[PDB]
């Protein structure tokens with residue numbers, strides 16, 4: 001129940017669409033990518049500009065409504081929808097202004113990655129972001145943001161030069177290395193904790209065609225593939241990215257039918273640089289086991305960004321457990337292969353990522369993103385369809401995580417699940433967490449933005 005005058009003032013200041021529980025489109029509007037999260041907002045405000053966001057933030061503050069902010073809706077924790085509060089939905093704010101001469105993109109806070117990459121690639125430009133096109137730029141960048149271009153050019157945040165942000169008090173600020181730098185530090189890895197980012201400004205790089213390969217190895221040859229991967233990446237040049245996704249093999253014609261539906265290592269690699277050198281480099285990493293279902297291509301960067309993942313199936317229900325490794329021992333490798341053999345759903349992946357490169361050359365304290373010096377990420381990313389099977393898939397991720405817990409430290413805030421609010425301090429570490437709490441005390445002292453990997457003020 002909402003104060004009529006406060007609601008009147010909000011409606012008159014707001015140029016976008018309000019979606020109420022009685023509206024026919026409410027049920028589709030409140031769904032987020034993680035289908036396990038079924039929540040009923042009091043109101044969904046589809047913002048269309050920075051002043052719309054200002055109006056929505058101030059209305060939420062005045063009315064005491066719990067604030068969810070939604071970019072692309074990919075929160076693995078379900079943060080972009082709430083029960084009984086307001087969803088400040090940015091998905092209609094999808095514009096990107098690209099300067100070819102100045103190598104700059106200014107993107108609104110509701111953009112999807114593929115809209116961004118299309119816009120920068122119209123000029124043969126790019127900057128790092130995630131590997132699945134329909135992820136939101138907003139939440140991805142605010143947690144750090146990594147993908148194919150990160151070993152060469154760093155995290156998304158390592159290319160961010162300024163933001164426009166709406167703070168809890170309704171104010172509009174610019175944050176950069178010269179203006180509100182304290183806030184600028186915090187938004188580079190501190191999530192949505194400090195306000196709603198309505199525009200991100202990035203430096204861009206010239207990224208022409210990319211030599212790429214995807215292939216599948218039997219688990220029989222798994223130990224030698226994973227060992228080759230971990231040994232090779234420790235000294236690989238920044239231009240090579242090579243990631244392992246343990247999963248059931250998808251039923252695609254490049255793979256023999258006898259492999260369909262059985263656990264495999266899906267290895268995907270690319271070279272950011274001359275494609276002739278790329279071909280030599282990829283061939284040098286393709287043969288530690290017999291590559292089944294090999295696809296090799298020289299792709300526009302926009303097509304590399306649109307490629308993941310083989311099978312092109314959007315799962316309905318997901319649960320993730322993730323952490324970093326400083327090293328991948330033989331023991332940890334055996335544990336990964338054992339648990340991969342038990343994967344049940346054709347949409348689950350046990351992901352082994354290697355960052356390092358340019359990400360690790362940024363000084364630890366230059367941004368709020370923790371664990372630059374840990375190059376391995378493991379993500380037990382369970383994903384499935386049947387709502388009656390939740391427990392079995394959730395248990396796979398939980399027990400695989402616990403089996404690896406002696407090797408895992410930290411945690412990427414953007415891979416946290418709905419039950420992982422407790423992991424925030426360990427993910428950031430004591431020093432970063434304390435600094436973040438100080439910025440929170442300055443810019444969000446009432447903790448208006450708490451549907452995120454939350455940093456309470458003080």
Ligand SMILES: Cc1cc2nc3c(=O)[nH]c(=O)nc-3n(C[C@H](O)[C@H](O)[C@H](O)COP(=O)(O)OP(=O)(O)OC[C@H]3O[C@@H](n4cnc5c(N)ncnc54)[C@H](O)[C@@H]3O)c2cc1C
Nearest residue numbers: 071072073074075080109130131136138139140146192197
């Ligand atoms: C299929 C898939 C693939 C992914 N791949 C990668 C990958 O390759 N690399 C990687 O780094 N991560 C990846 N992620 C994780 C992704 O970084 C996080 O899920 C991220 O939070 C998604 O952002 P979003 O805007 O889509 O999500 P939302 O659920 O809309 O929001 C996520 C969080 O950010 C906040 N938020 C969103 N936009 C804004 C904004 N403009 N201003 C302020 N707060 C905001 C929300 O309040 C919430 O706390 C992937 C996720 C999915 C589901």
